[PDB]
Amino acid sequence: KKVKIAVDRNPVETSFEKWAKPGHFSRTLSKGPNTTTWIWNLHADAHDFDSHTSDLEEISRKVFSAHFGQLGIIFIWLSGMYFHGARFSNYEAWLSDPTHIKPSAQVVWPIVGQEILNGDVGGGFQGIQITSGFFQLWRASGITSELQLYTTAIGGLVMAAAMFFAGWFHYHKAAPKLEWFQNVESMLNHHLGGLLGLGSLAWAGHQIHVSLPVNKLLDAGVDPKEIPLPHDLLLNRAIMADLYPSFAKGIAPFFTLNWSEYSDFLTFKGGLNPVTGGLWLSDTAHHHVAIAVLFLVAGHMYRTNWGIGHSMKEILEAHRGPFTGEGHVGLYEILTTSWHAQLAINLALFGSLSIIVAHHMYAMPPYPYLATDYGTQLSLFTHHTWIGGFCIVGAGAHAAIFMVRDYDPTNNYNNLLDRVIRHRDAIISHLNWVCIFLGFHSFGLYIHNDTMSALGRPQDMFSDTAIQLQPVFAQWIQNTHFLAPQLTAPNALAATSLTWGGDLVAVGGKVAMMPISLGTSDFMVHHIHAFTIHVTVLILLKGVLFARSSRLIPDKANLGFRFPCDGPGRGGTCQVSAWDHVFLGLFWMYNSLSIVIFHFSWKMQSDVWGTVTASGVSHITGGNFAQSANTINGWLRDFLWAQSSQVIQSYGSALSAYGLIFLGAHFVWAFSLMFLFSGRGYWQELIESIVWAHNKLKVAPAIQPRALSITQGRAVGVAHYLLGGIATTWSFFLARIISVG
Amino acid sequence: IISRRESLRALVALSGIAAIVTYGLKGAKDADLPITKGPQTTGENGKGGSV
Amino acid sequence: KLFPKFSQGLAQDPTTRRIWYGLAMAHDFESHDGMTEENLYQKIFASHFGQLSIIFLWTSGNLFHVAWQGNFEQWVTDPVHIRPIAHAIWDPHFGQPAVEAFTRGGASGPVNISTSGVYQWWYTIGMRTNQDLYVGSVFLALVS
Amino acid sequence: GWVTFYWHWKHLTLWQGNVAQFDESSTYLMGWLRDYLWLNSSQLINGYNPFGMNSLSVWAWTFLFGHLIYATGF
Amino acid sequence: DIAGLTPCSESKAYAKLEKKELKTLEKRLKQYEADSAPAVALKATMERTKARFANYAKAGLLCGNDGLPHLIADPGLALKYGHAGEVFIPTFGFLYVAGYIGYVGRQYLIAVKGEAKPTDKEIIIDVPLATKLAWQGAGWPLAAVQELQRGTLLEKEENITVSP
Amino acid sequence: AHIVKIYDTCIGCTQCVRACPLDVLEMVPWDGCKASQMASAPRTEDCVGCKRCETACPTDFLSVRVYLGSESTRSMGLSY
Amino acid sequence: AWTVPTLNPDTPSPIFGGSTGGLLRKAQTEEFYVITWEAKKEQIFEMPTGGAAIMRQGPNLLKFGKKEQCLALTTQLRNKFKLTPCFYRVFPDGKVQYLHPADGVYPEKVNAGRVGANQNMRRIGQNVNPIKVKFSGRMMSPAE
Numbered sequence A: 001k002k003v004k005i006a007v008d009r010n011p012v013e014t015s016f017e018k019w020a021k022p023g024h025f026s027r028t029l030s031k032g033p034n035t036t037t038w039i040w041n042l043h044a045d046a047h048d049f050d051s052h053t054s055d056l057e058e059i060s061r062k063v064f065s066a067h068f069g070q071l072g073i074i075f076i077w078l079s080g081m082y083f084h085g086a087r088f089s090n091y092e093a094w095l096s097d098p099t100h101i102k103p104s105a106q107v108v109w110p111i112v113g114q115e116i117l118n119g120d121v122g123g124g125f126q127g128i129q130i131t132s133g134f135f136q137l138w139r140a141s142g143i144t145s146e147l148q149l150y151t152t153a154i155g156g157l158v159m160a161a162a163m164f165f166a167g168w169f170h171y172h173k174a175a176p177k178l179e180w181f182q183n184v185e186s187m188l189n190h191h192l193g194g195l196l197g198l199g200s201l202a203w204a205g206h207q208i209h210v211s212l213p214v215n216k217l218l219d220a221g222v223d224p225k226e227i228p229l230p231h232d233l234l235l236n237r238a239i240m241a242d243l244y245p246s247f248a249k250g251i252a253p254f255f256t257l258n259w260s261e262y263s264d265f266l267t268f269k270g271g272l273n274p275v276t277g278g279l280w281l282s283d284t285a286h287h288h289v290a291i292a293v294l295f296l297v298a299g300h301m302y303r304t305n306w307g308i309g310h311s312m313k314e315i316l317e318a319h320r321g322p323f324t325g326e327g328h329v330g331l332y333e334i335l336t337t338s339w340h341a342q343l344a345i346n347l348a349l350f351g352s353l354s355i356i357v358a359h360h361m362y363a364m365p366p367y368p369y370l371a372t373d374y375g376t377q378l379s380l381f382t383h384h385t386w387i388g389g390f391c392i393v394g395a396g397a398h399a400a401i402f403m404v405r406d407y408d409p410t411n412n413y414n415n416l417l418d419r420v421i422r423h424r425d426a427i428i429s430h431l432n433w434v435c436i437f438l439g440f441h442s443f444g445l446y447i448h449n450d451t452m453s454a455l456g457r458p459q460d461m462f463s464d465t466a467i468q469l470q471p472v473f474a475q476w477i478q479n480t481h482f483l484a485p486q487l488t489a490p491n492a493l494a495a496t497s498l499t500w501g502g503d504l505v506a507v508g509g510k511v512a513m514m515p516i517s518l519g520t521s522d523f524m525v526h527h528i529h530a531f532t533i534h535v536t537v538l539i540l541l542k543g544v545l546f547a548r549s550s551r552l553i554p555d556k557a558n559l560g561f562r563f564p565c566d567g568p569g570r571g572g573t574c575q576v577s578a579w580d581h582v583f584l585g586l587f588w589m590y591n592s593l594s595i596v597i598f599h600f601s602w603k604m605q606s607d608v609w610g611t612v613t614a615s616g617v618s619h620i621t622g623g624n625f626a627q628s629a630n631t632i633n634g635w636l637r638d639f640l641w642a643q644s645s646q647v648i649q650s651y652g653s654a655l656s657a658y659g660l661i662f663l664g665a666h667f668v669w670a671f672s673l674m675f676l677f678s679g680r681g682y683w684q685e686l687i688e689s690i691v692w693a694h695n696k697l698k699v700a701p702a703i704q705p706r707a708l709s710i711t712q713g714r715a716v717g718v719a720h721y722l723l724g725g726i727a728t729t730w731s732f733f734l735a736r737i738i739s740v741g
Numbered sequence B: 001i002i003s004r005r006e007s008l009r010a011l012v013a014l015s016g017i018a019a020i021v022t023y024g025l026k027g028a029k030d031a032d033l034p035i036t037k038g039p040q041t042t043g044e045n046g047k048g049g050s051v
Numbered sequence C: 001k002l003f004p005k006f007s008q009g010l011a012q013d014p015t016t017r018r019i020w021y022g023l024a025m026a027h028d029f030e031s032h033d034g035m036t037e038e039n040l041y042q043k044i045f046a047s048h049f050g051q052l053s054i055i056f057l058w059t060s061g062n063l064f065h066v067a068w069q070g071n072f073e074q075w076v077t078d079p080v081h082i083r084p085i086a087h088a089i090w091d092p093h094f095g096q097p098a099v100e101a102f103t104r105g106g107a108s109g110p111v112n113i114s115t116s117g118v119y120q121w122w123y124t125i126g127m128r129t130n131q132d133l134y135v136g137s138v139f140l141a142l143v144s
Numbered sequence D: 001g002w003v004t005f006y007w008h009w010k011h012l013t014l015w016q017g018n019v020a021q022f023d024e025s026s027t028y029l030m031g032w033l034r035d036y037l038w039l040n041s042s043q044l045i046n047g048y049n050p051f052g053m054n055s056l057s058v059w060a061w062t063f064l065f066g067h068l069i070y071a072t073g074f
Numbered sequence E: 001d002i003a004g005l006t007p008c009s010e011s012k013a014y015a016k017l018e019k020k021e022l023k024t025l026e027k028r029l030k031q032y033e034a035d036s037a038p039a040v041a042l043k044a045t046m047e048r049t050k051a052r053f054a055n056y057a058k059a060g061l062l063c064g065n066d067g068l069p070h071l072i073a074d075p076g077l078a079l080k081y082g083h084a085g086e087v088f089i090p091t092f093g094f095l096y097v098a099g100y101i102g103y104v105g106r107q108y109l110i111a112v113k114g115e116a117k118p119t120d121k122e123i124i125i126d127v128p129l130a131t132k133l134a135w136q137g138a139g140w141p142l143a144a145v146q147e148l149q150r151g152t153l154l155e156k157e158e159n160i161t162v163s164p
Numbered sequence F: 001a002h003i004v005k006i007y008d009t010c011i012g013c014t015q016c017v018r019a020c021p022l023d024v025l026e027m028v029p030w031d032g033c034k035a036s037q038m039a040s041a042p043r044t045e046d047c048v049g050c051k052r053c054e055t056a057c058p059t060d061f062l063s064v065r066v067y068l069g070s071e072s073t074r075s076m077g078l079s080y
Numbered sequence G: 001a002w003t004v005p006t007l008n009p010d011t012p013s014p015i016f017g018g019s020t021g022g023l024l025r026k027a028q029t030e031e032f033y034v035i036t037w038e039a040k041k042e043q044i045f046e047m048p049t050g051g052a053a054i055m056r057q058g059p060n061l062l063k064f065g066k067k068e069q070c071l072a073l074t075t076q077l078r079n080k081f082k083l084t085p086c087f088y089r090v091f092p093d094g095k096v097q098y099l100h101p102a103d104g105v106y107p108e109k110v111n112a113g114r115v116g117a118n119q120n121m122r123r124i125g126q127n128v129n130p131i132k133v134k135f136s137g138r139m140m141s142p143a144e
């Protein structure tokens, strides 16, 4: 059996002896400090497992049990939210009136006057109005009681200690060998089939047998203490046949292939559930069934111990063409003896999945009473774009680390990876052009509209009453996908969302989802998005391809991944390393994603969100997006100034914490400019002047004060730039959208 | 007319002469330059609000 | 090769920072090539004439555009409600709403309200008529 | 910038007449933000809009022009 | 009434703002049953609030044009008019604790340099040593001014310089 | 043409020469050290001034020393 | 025994399909630097201009546009593979100049017969003040 369990018994003694000696992992740190750069290099090099040792087996065991540590912390984090969902919440009261009672699950302690953050969220309850949307998960899960939240919180603590056991066991007691990890055929067969396939089979079975009969009784209208408990929905088939009359046929229509007889509770409805605003749950049930059958089929693709199935070395080495030399030869060997090469491809798509998730959830809101909660909708979009955006920059960072550390010029000869480096000047320069092309022809349209509107020439702007730049292609797709149930998807009862066209869903006198009409302001801002992503690509891909060498510095890989510079010579070589390109890319990721979440938070408030009266529905900001997003001054006036009037005068209320962090993150943002502008050799000399006054009063420390390193003072700078930048928009968005929505 | 460098330097400069010295009087189009118009209705009010 | 006449070490520079450092250390007289201390003080002393001749040409410019395009003779009589005028506007990029929105202060064409406040300084040192302001402009233009 | 924020805003509240609107709000930094920068930039940023424009549009344009040179400095 | 001021027990914008806050709490209190803990919490907020106004007027805090407690940070105008508790008492209540933390941290660094490698005992704080200096540093001004008289507080020009 | 001038505090451990990415430095005999050698810079026409030499000198207040002078097409590190 | 080897361009290049990081128009006007080594066996090195080239047995001729691009090639040819290369400097009038083992022995080891230029028989802390070297024709460091 080439695919087999292979571990090593007791590699590391479970002992506190190495906790006594910090910096024990590295040669350069184990000799103790003499300098405050020791304790920063301790935390910097702590999880740099490739730099501790050279053994790939010892690296692999370290990242395998650290992943149990991250999963074990997520299980604490989930079990916190079910516990704070249970003991300090209004989820009992929220289910009876989920239109007026604001979701709240954080309650503060009345000490310094901070009990004013316990707002009047309704439901006989005081607490911080949450926006993470767990109450919409739980109605979609059919929880209906705070007993169920408490039992799955205890189930979360149990699972977290099991995950902490597992990382302890699979590192200290019985840790795997190297060729266990290098069975990537067996890993994908198990993860596509068992994790993704059987997971969505199991969750569909939760949706068939628990969530569908509970949420059918909630939509038909039953108080949640009167609904049958979901174990009674298992043991009694006669209850299920009352709601969906095809459970009386049992599981006979499945094996007799009479699957059309399951049409009551596996549907293809589409659109939205008009009672609750969310997606249809029977639609999501047939979703996760058909997802599961797809992944279990795809989970039997790769060859492990019997000759059937594909082998990824042969799949890669066969796809070779006349333009690319050897083709994909040698990519299997570098995606199996390098974690950073795995981590780059993983963080790319997993970050790109998060932005797929964010865009597919305002438009197709999967949870009951999710869409009318405008606070949850704004946060669940905004969060999952940022979490995507960091992970995409992490793809650029750890691809560069592959090029510096784990790249092998020997085994990479005239494959794709060798030929990308050999025309890396053509790659960056044609990308340099299209960023400059997108720079003028997207942002200069805004400067044109600023100038024409300031010069009293509104007929010469780029707007709808002026030179019209319509998004012809995206308006064409909305005319097709709304007409898709006509003949291209004839079994759909409605469209796949309501952005494509049609009518709105009114739930509780508020718009769940209405159609989105794209205009010239939507044209300009989508090309702003194309601009900022191509520049973010430009910086990160320059760091990947010029990680090893350039015409500037030929021996750059010998200097490593994270170095400051090569000195002031040849004009200056500040920020030439591949660390420094993923330093600069974080600002453009910040610059790209801020305009994404600004274009979300103002298109929805102008053209989607708002109260409906069946009398000419009014939106939140009155319908002023295409009227005003032509100009930078429109983004200044109508978005950053008009909508800031709920974060600046929110004092004396529960939203006053958002007013503090609005000033708090305006501080921390600007605090970063002390680090982003200045440099070390100033601050080291200033320390010498104050070590002098500490020498004079005999309080000279033994761990000697040094200024922060060159790369560290940059890394402190971009960390406080992003923390002060994002938490500004966090508190701006939430203090806006909790009040007006 | 012009074939060398200093002949072309004269012709570009004299063509810049011939446009601009006319543009102030004959070349200010009725639709292009609203400053070269007549004094229209109002505008000469105080700066607003208070003093 | 010729533009930094002061620094021949910049004249041997084949790159484009030759232009940038020809500008920025052109007034760093202590580091020019062949500079002596008698040659140092003479270029500083003539440059102070260059600063003075700019200031008086600048101030004679303020006296001219107020005397010609300003409303100083109208502002003398009512110095509270009439707003001051710096210099009239000729921007051919304007539109017609941007002509009539900048006509203010009782003037004919578009104007700029002078916030520098040289009317209040001139009104209290005896200036009353525009003919007293042209004479001051021609005087400083001679002195410049 | 700190001496001129304090000069201007104590003089705005003096010249408007609401001399107590400073002393209530100058004691804490939100009143610097929502009563001096937010409140007094109402007619500035309205120098040009899609409704029209007025005499403040040359100072409205420069106010965005100043933010542009500033950020180009970073 | 020291510098254009007034006692907060005597001003009326102070009492107007007290009645402003209790108005906001009571119109927030009205949404709940009289047994409910979201109303028990708000009535406990009021009795912390109303005692707070009673205690600020009890201490004789100075209000002004805005009806807020204004502080007088000058001895001779606080000692004379009975306001040393505003600034002049906590300016020594602080500077006891401040130089306490300084002296304990001083004595820990002085008594660690005579060792094998003192940099190790700035990571790993000798807790039986550090707590011992923590308790016995409680008379630190009595110990510092005796060290101030010797010349052992100030190290001489053994200190490190660049180019004098 | 950058100005590289070294000093008598050299000990001749020749780490500056091995660190120089442009062969500016070489090792000349000199009796003022145990290793009987002191560096020399006969090729400062080729120097960029990237200061990899004086990142590598062990001696306090570095023995090798680079003064950034006037930049030719070799000092700016140009393939063009 | 050693003196000044010459060049023939007949010697074969490494097998490399060409990169865009190679020479530029500076090679046709100013200078370009060629590098030679004698390889024992056929193996795969990294080009300093990005990519990977394979060396062949015998002499190997390669050309670059910088001096660091050649010495960052010998650095991985001497430390990794224990070869002994040497690179030259070719001018577009055909003139060639010998550069790296300029007296045969590599510059980390003493040749006892190379001349100690650019040295100060004094300590770096014993420089003069810039007031003494002021007005030295051009701007001048006190370390001269």
Ligand code: CLA
Binding pocket: A043, A044, A045, A046, A047, A048, A049, A347, A390, A391, A392, A393, A394, A395, A397, A398, A401, A561, A562, A579, A582, A583, A719, A723
């Ligand atoms: C799957 C996720 C993942 C994983 C496993 C890694 C793993 C690694 N990364 Mg990596 N990275 C990721 C995502 C990931 N990264 C992303 C998303 C980015 C883009 C932001 C980067 C950018 C990046 C860079 C630029 C570098 C690494 C480095 C490293 C290595 C060592 C990290 C270390 O020891 O730091 C230990 C952990 C810390 C020092 C903590 C950092 C403190 C953060 C910045 C503060 C923020 C915390 C919180 C959000 C703020 C609120 C806290 C509150 C108290 C205020 C290790 C291989 C380094 C490396 O390989 O060096 C050669 C390196 O230089 N990564």
Ligand code: CLA
Binding pocket: A063, A064, A067, A068, A071, A180, A181, A183, A184, A186, A187, A190, A191, A193, A194, A195
């Ligand atoms: C069908 C079997 C199966 C399943 C379900 C998984 C599941 C998982 N593997 Mg995995 N793996 C498998 C087979 C399987 N593996 C095989 C055969 C190999 C060898 C080729 C590996 C090698 C491997 C590596 C190297 C890594 C994983 C990781 C992961 C986790 C992904 C993290 C995530 O997305 O959260 C999903 C989380 C959940 C679904 C929560 C449920 C967790 C369950 C209870 C544990 C997984 C089931 C377990 C494999 C069955 C054995 C039970 C145990 C008692 C013996 C996830 C728990 C990564 C990880 O997180 O490390 C810990 C990781 O680094 N796997």
Ligand code: CLA
Binding pocket: A432, A435, A436, A437, A438, A439, A440, A443, A444, A447, A535, A538, A539, A584, A587, A588, D068, D071, D072, D073, D074
């Ligand atoms: C608002 C501030 C600002 C501006 C304008 C720029 C501008 C630019 N950056 Mg940039 N940058 C900034 C802040 C800014 N940056 C910050 C804060 C950082 C820190 C991390 C960076 C980091 C950064 C990197 C890392 C990169 C850029 C890049 C670019 C260029 C791409 C855009 C382009 O070509 O469009 C064209 C220019 C504009 C749209 C500016 C407005 C000009 C208008 C439209 C017309 C021009 C006026 C006209 C000619 C009239 C002239 C009058 C006459 C008298 C002269 C461009 C030069 C990328 C680059 O150079 O490659 C493409 C790149 O790689 N920048």
Ligand SMILES: CCCCCCCCCCCCO[C@H]1O[C@H](CO)[C@@H](O[C@H]2O[C@H](CO)[C@@H](O)[C@H](O)[C@H]2O)[C@H](O)[C@H]1O
Binding pocket: A234, A235, A236, A237, A238
């Ligand atoms: C993990 C293994 C995968 C398979 C999943 C098994 C999960 C365990 C579920 C056990 C719960 C009991 O499930 C099962 O109980 C009863 C006994 O047939 C069935 O109940 C049915 O059968 C009884 C006798 O036949 C009658 O009262 C009715 O026909 C009807 O109530 C339920 O339709 C079914 O839900």
Ligand SMILES: CC1=C(C/C=C(\C)CCC[C@H](C)CCC[C@H](C)CCCC(C)C)C(=O)c2ccccc2C1=O
Binding pocket: A674, A675, A676, A678, A679, A680, A683, A684, A706, A707, A708, A709, A710, A712, A713, A714
């Ligand atoms: C301010 C600044 C510094 C100075 C920052 C100093 C060195 C560090 C800031 C304080 C550190 C975090 C020490 C404070 C906490 C210590 C652990 C001591 C704790 C003692 C009590 C507070 C518990 C730099 O070193 C620097 C370097 C490069 C570019 C820019 C800069 C820069 O802008």
